[PDB]
Symmetry: D2
Subunit: 337 residues, 4 copies
Amino acid sequence: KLKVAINGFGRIGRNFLRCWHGRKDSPLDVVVINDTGGVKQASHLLKYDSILGTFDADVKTAGDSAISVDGKVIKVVSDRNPVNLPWGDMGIDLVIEGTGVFVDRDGAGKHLQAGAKKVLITAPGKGDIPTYVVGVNEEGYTHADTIISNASCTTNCLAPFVKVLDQKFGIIKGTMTTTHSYTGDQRLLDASHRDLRRARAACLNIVPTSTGAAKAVALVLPNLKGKLNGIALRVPTPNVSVVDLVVQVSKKTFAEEVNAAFRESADNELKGILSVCDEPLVSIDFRCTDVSSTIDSSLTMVMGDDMVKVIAWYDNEWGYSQRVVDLADIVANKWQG
Amino acid sequence: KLKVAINGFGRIGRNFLRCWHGRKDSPLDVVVINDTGGVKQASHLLKYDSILGTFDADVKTAGDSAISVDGKVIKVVSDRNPVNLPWGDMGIDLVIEGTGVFVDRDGAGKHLQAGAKKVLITAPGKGDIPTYVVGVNEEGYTHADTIISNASCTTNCLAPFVKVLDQKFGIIKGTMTTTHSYTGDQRLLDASHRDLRRARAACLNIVPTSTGAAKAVALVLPNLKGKLNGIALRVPTPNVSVVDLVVQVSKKTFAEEVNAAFRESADNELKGILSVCDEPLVSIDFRCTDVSSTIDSSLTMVMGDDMVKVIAWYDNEWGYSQRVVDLADIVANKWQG
Amino acid sequence: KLKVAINGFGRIGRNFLRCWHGRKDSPLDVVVINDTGGVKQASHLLKYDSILGTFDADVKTAGDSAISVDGKVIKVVSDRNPVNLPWGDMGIDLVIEGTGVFVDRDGAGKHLQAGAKKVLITAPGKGDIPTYVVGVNEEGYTHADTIISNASCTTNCLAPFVKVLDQKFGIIKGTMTTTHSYTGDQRLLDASHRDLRRARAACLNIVPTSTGAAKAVALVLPNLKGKLNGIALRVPTPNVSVVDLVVQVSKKTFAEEVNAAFRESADNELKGILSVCDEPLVSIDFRCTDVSSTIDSSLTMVMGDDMVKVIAWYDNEWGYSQRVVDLADIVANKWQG
Amino acid sequence: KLKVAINGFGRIGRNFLRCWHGRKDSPLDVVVINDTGGVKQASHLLKYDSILGTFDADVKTAGDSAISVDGKVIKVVSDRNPVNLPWGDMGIDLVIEGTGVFVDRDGAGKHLQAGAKKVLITAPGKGDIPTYVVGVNEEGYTHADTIISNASCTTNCLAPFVKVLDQKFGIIKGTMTTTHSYTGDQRLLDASHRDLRRARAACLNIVPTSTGAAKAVALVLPNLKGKLNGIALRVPTPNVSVVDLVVQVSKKTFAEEVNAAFRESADNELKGILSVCDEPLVSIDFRCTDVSSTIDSSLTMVMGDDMVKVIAWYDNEWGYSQRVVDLADIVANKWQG
Ligand SMILES: NC(=O)C1=CN([C@@H]2O[C@@H](COP(=O)(O)OP(=O)(O)OC[C@@H]3O[C@H](n4cnc5c(N)ncnc54)[C@@H](OP(=O)(O)O)[C@@H]3O)[C@H](O)[C@@H]2O)C=CC1
Ligand SMILES: NC(=O)C1=CN([C@H]2O[C@@H](COP(=O)(O)OP(=O)(O)OC[C@@H]3O[C@H](n4cnc5c(N)ncnc54)[C@@H](OP(=O)(O)O)[C@@H]3O)[C@H](O)[C@@H]2O)C=CC1
Ligand SMILES: NC(=O)C1=CN([C@H]2O[C@@H](COP(=O)(O)OP(=O)(O)OC[C@@H]3O[C@H](n4cnc5c(N)ncnc54)[C@@H](OP(=O)(O)O)[C@@H]3O)[C@H](O)[C@@H]2O)C=CC1
Ligand SMILES: NC(=O)C1=CN([C@H]2O[C@@H](COP(=O)(O)OP(=O)(O)OC[C@@H]3O[C@H](n4cnc5c(N)ncnc54)[C@@H](OP(=O)(O)O)[C@@H]3O)[C@H](O)[C@@H]2O)C=CC1
């Protein structure tokens, strides 16, 4: 309904397309893809996926500049400079920025220069970019926002249950550590990053790094400003991560009561965003889960009556991509066109 | 002087022998190895190691029942039943119990049935077994102890710096999470295991599992009884782990002061046990670390002035094995003639 | 129909059940499972699988000899000694031997001693045990065989296209190497193993070992007796393997002719057993393929006009289990009764 | 004594420096490194290495544009365009091309435009570029060659023993498959790549791909022109690979005679280049071996008296780098000022 582009057909760009494809009566219309790798590459990697498996749909190249998914043709262009895009010419309403390189206003704005009406960054925005997490603060979105951010995968897993903890128990302060699957931003073998730790062979190490949620939860939950901080430990799994949150709360409590609080929200205001799992599972079991965060109930602990530790699972690729679709639906729903 | 026997030539048993081989003027004499796998196996796996690399020493079989390391002939026996071992006949003073199956008094005691004078379990002891962590409470060891425990790798990493935190700031309570390398106790592919999570493919998942390290810390640091708890996350790396500790302390502080407190101890009472690393390193850098615990200084955080988060690295196989040697050395030094 | 019992509820045992569950109008009725790990374990590991994903069926324990799959109750017993199994009492017609420890006549026979009418070993049989590979020599099966073998996963990948090569070009001699995913028989970390190479950390090494696929091929294709040999290279992937076969043929040929030969069989006598893939795919893309062998057409080479090199993919767990089901179906179809 | 510059401080670039550092009385003087990543990054990654371990040398940054190794300062520049490099200004005699992007004459020639006297590509050269393999055809090198190639890692493993096989038995034709560790050219997670197979998650798949090694082996051993071909299977190991070569020979033989032939050469003309291992080892055991190729003797087979299969290990990073140093040594030894 809404004319959508995908700038950056990588893990999130492709997960997004496949997430979108599975939705019924979607308001979005993905008409174009900017894949610097080309048509053959876009069709191949969309069909065959090391993490999601083979796409259950007819996918093929259509000519020299498009691909088709179950008959639907999707234009495919290739340009590293978004100021060279044909968004205006195509009448593109929303650009899904998934390249990871245009996360500030001047960068994402290049899409507007090219004629796109709006931009949704699949990552934290740098600068003065409205950030939103579905199930946490999306009601604050307004059609005037020309550039928005859907935050990070970790922020999407944390914020939902942090919101519950703060409302029910009141968070004085907390820390978080995410044991995170590796991502394309890491090097296969010891190379070159900025980040000397992400420069190291990712399938061989536990890699401490930069955390991507910590301040950002305060962005979507202002009451938490200056109350949280954390880090990330990248480990040798290709997908699915888990956050370990420890917080001192003002109201004394115990593990079972904390879990109960999560189940209540899970069955109500956070249905489809938060889930609570009582089974002794491991990361692989959470692949392709549509929720943003799944509490591992049996792992919840309370020390000294007010120090609560919570363990939550998240599919950083798929679960996050479903949220990108959700945020895109909101954009469409609140359109002033 | 101390005639030593290694029961269970596995990861720890082999790491132990190589750790011991590297010491100068050792008061220990490893005369025999109980390897149910045989002499060829013992010689081969001691020489070639997927984690430590090839042993820089002349290793070979010596007849049917021995092996030699740089000329030093060692005996090799094979019996799954410790009562039937020739410890008395051989005059064995101390047995390094590294099978992982004789961790209680009745089990480890079988070595005493057999004639050994003392047993040192390379793991937490079950029941009433004296537990010691070098650099924390080893001064409490007495020659009267027939059976002793060197705790777990995680306890050895945690205790040292927990001791420092408690002394300098006073720990009210806290929680810990160890992102741990897999170990032989896990299954390569989904297979039977009493622990339904450890039963799952170890190189494919992030596996949550219980840990006693929290309560064990209280064993060697009584002041901490009932103040800690935690869990473990087994991840797809073959060696080297990291502990994430969050504690509320009584004295307000900040990250750099906390890191300073650790360096002070590291340059003094905990020299050779605790180190503080200021480099942006990853898990493979810490292989073959003779200390028990290395603080990653740049990851230390303090929230709300009294919630301290510390990240510490540890080579669970080698570092721990150097501690086993250390404890053995203490046994030999306190032996009563 | 045909009261089937699964002995050994491991990778194959569970893949088998799931493969069977997916069949329509199956002549087989799986009524019992001997799982030494217990009911809870059986239900859990059948539901959650690190390789196949979460089973899309209602699986739960059935109060505690039993489990239920979509309402179908399956009895669960636990005994490491087959002679003590209630096969006779239950009227069990065919036992799927998937423990990997009862592969000879005396061992597998234990199931007959226990009352089972027939045994199907999910592996090469030791000694005089009729071996069959569907699509190659299954027409030779007779109800008189009390104990049969479905060969190995590599033999099931190799035989089908070797049969084609021998008929179409005539194999003078050849060699084979299978770059095989690791299996439960390997060790997670360096540990005891009769085979000093499989004793080594499986996810950290390229491990050369044995196979019997070569001589086993001769079993189902007599014309090939003494004409082939080979080895295996176990690598760090959890599932899916690939065979590299090099043979000198009597009739000069070229790569595309060879590929054509495979497509002819694939569309005819070997439909559902052999496939030919023209896509530039990788191992993960072949997960859950029902065929026994998939030729990677673009990799086919011919040197000196008569030295043919063929690369074929196979899902060693799933593809092989579909063959077990197939052979079981034949057993049922030829039952006297 | 030869002024050497390293272009592209990656896996090979760094392995090269470390190999060079370990040589005694080297005729090479590495005075500069072109690392687009910067000084801090060059120092760090040279010191800490996921595959080689921590560099046993004092490594630090020296100012804003150099690094020091045990006191020796090495200049560090940063430019992606070789024409702009200060080779002429610095008087650079030989440039080690390890970027992987300047492999043809026009590309590597950019270094000559920049003032360098000679270029050594650490990879197969494209077009008319003299290719050499130490121990095979290096005696053919002449100072007139402004741009030379040290071939590929697999070519360096294969050529040496292929040379023996051809001389001793006469190779009519053959095929080869290399089960190769992943390299930086692959993607960590499904991502864009001209090669649709190399685009797939490298630590999750058996990856089928190129090797010009077969035709390259022809380049250094003319007698083998048009007689060999092959492919590569990239697998989930970070370093160390193995080649499987099958060849029909004109002189009937047997496995032990073939192994003998390799030991003869290994103790004589190919000492330091080829080795023969009789131990049942796995890939990890061959890390950091200086030789180019190590035959795994117990794996050698001969079918039909003339079809020879040989398995050889090689450390693709380190062993190859040792050859780069050897070839650089030749350049210095044959310099004509
Ligand atoms: N790895 C192995 O086993 C072997 C590999 N190959 C060897 O040599 C290769 C190099 O691969 P390897 O050492 O593995 O890999 P790497 O990616 O780690 O090596 C060198 C690399 O050069 C880069 N570089 C790229 N473009 C430029 C440029 N324009 N100017 C300056 N520096 C540049 C790097 O930059 P950036 O940081 O942007 O990537 C990086 O450190 C060839 O491509 C070839 O195959 C051959 C033999 C053995
Ligand atoms: N991966 C996850 O779990 C999640 C990641 N983040 C993701 O959104 C990101 C994208 O990461 P992800 O999808 O993982 O990764 P990828 O590398 O796989 O995703 C997108 C990529 O964009 C590239 N690209 C780069 N520059 C341009 C350009 N100038 N014009 C057009 N296309 C371009 C690609 O090109 P090239 O081929 O040259 O690399 C590639 O397919 C942000 O960087 C962020 O973190 C957020 C949430 C979840
Ligand atoms: N791995 C680490 O990082 C550390 C582990 N723990 C280590 O100590 C353990 C040993 O683990 P680890 O060395 O890793 O493991 P491994 O399995 O490699 O070590 C010892 C093992 O003893 C076996 N063994 C078992 N039962 C007997 C028996 N009845 N008689 C004789 N030998 C026997 C072996 O036999 P079999 O061949 O049949 O398996 C094998 O070599 C405890 O169980 C504990 O946790 C503690 C600290 C550090
Ligand atoms: N995996 C593959 O790709 C294929 C494997 N093979 C296999 O069939 C095999 C089975 O291996 P796989 O399914 O991989 O592996 P697993 O280890 O997972 O399968 C079966 C296993 O049986 C065990 N078991 C062992 N001894 C007994 C006993 N005495 N009584 C009852 N149950 C027992 C188990 O017990 P415990 O819990 O103590 O280990 C476990 O679930 C053969 O050994 C063979 O190779 C053949 C074709 C394909």
